[PDB]
Amino acid sequence: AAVTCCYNFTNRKISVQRLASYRRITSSKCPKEAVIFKTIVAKEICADPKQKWVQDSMDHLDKQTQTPKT
């Protein structure tokens, strides 16, 4: 399941309305630790774990998964 690496990060914030899910690259076998966002049209975008918007976006996605409303 860990068969890709991020070689660069995006340099712009993704609005959270475009975001569907995320995966973390923590493997020391990759050049750098990364966050991969999957967007609502299934694009996979590498992002810097140290930027606030990346951290805020994971928080927001986790809250949605945890409190769905019927």
């Binding site: 860990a2 890709t4 995006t10």
Partner: protein
């Protein structure tokens, strides 16, 4: 809603060193050609072969070095596996 052509995750193979290496040196990314930086370590392995490699099992991979998005053959082989 565009994203840079260098922002896609890239297929890799792990080895007995501490760093995995790229499968080839280019791929389609966000409508353009994602070429890895010159000098990046890579394996001369086609994505279509990589797609069907058995995970976990050790293969012998041809080592290479990226130049202008092509993994140039270094005429050397090393242990490689799919799955980090």
């Amino acid at each position: 809603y565009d994203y840079g052509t260098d922002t896609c995750p890239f297929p890799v193979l792990a080895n007995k060193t501490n760093k995995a290496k790229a499968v080839g040196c280019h791929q389609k990314c966000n409508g353009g050609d994602q070429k890895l930086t010159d000098g990046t370590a890579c394996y001369v392995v086609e994505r279509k072969v990589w797609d069907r490699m058995t995970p976990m099992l050790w293969y012998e991979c041809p080592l290479g070095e990226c130049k202008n998005g092509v993994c140039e053959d270094l005429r050397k082989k090393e242990d490689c596996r799919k799955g980090n």
